[PDB]
Amino acid sequence: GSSGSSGVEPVPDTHLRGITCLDHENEKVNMYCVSDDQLICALCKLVGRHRDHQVASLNDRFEKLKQTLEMNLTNLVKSGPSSG
Ligand SMILES: [Zn+2]
Ligand SMILES: [Zn+2]
């Protein structure tokens, strides 16, 4: 077998040069919900509460045509001792 350990790095202070989604601070809202009258992203319409909602696509020319599943990552995390 094998043994390995690791920690985690703090998210980089995102600049104000790119508006993201509320729930998802990574996906750039590329859609807009009519019923909810609120800008949403792909993840919001994919699995988000807007699963079967009526959104009005923005980008005329479909960009994301093909769709596949991305390999999921499995990591660990647990706080330990410390001093000052
Ligand atoms: Zn979203
Ligand atoms: Zn909605």
Distances (CA, A) of 63 to 7, 13, 36, 57: 36, 28, 24, 11
CATH architecture of 1-84: 2-Layer Sandwich (3.30)
CA–centroid distance, residue 52 to ligand 2 (Å): 8
Technique behind the model: NMR
Under a CB-based contact definition with an 8 Å cutoff, are residues 79 and 57 in contact? no
Helix, strand, coil abundance in the chain, percent, nearest 5:
5, 10, 85
Distances (CA, A) of 18 to 22, 24, 25: 13, 13, 10
In degrees and rounded to multiples of 5, residue 62 shows phi and psi of: -45, 120
What is the separation of C-alpha 84 from the centre of its chain, rounded to a whole number of angstroms?
36
CB-based contacts of 6, cutoff 8 Å, min separation 6: 75, 76
CA–centroid distance, residue 45 to ligand 1 (Å): 7
How far is residue 42's CA from residue 28's CA, in Å, rounded to a whole number?
8
